[PDB]
């Protein structure tokens, strides 16, 4: 579309403040659960990444929610599923910082 070289424009929008997938460890809370192993050892969430056009402005979330996602708790005669909830962002926004 716009080169083998990623064009400016396509570079900016791609690297702009939006919610995006970030690997995150298991939550202190399901790290305590009585289980022989926890599968997987990490969960990918959606979080305000990218960057603002300033040192001053920071990419923050204007829309967010807790995701319930089931983790496998290998244990006992039979493994079972446990629910892990954490912070996940849907809407993001580049906003001014704090002092």
């Amino acid at each position: 579309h716009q080169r083998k070289v990623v064009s400016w424009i396509d570079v900016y929008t791609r690297a702009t403040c939006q919610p995006r997938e970030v690997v995150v460890p298991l939550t202190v809370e399901l790290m305590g659960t009585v289980a022989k192993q926890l599968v997987p050892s990490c969960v990918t969430v959606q979080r305000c990444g990218g960057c603002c056009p300033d040192d001053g402005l920071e990419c923050v979330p204007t829309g967010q929610h807790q995701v319930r996602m089931q983790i496998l708790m290998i244990r006992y005669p039979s493994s079972q599923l446990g629910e892990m909830s954490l912070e996940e962002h849907s809407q993001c926004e580049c906003r001014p910082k704090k002092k």
């Binding site: 400016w8 900016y12 929008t13 056009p53 300033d54 001053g56 402005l57 580049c94």
Partner: protein
């Protein structure tokens, strides 16, 4: 020829670098030739800004003149115009400091 293009200042593969500051005037100078061309000012991402009074003013020989600009306006503002099916777009990058 390419005559039929809505936007006066040609090109826009690279946006025009416009210096600005919060609280003061912002001019997105995407002036068209013919007065009656439908131009829609956007702002990456999905928030379009529509003319009125101060907070947005449309001018054919000038452009979108924003009184009391904010951070909401810092970055890539795109001017769009569809002429005979073809969607022309000119780009403008703002900043401070």
């Amino acid at each position: 020829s390419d005559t039929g293009r809505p936007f006066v200042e040609m090109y826009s593969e690279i946006p025009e670098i416009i210096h600005m500051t919060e609280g003061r005037e912002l001019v997105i100078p995407c002036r068209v030739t013919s007065p009656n061309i439908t131009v829609t000012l956007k702002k990456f991402p999905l928030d379009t800004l529509i003319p009125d009074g101060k907070r947005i003013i449309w001018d054919s020989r000038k452009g979108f003149i924003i009184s009391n600009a904010t951070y909401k306006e810092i970055g890539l503002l795109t001017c769009e115009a569809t002429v005979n099916g073809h969607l022309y777009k000119t780009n403008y990058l703002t900043h401070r400091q």
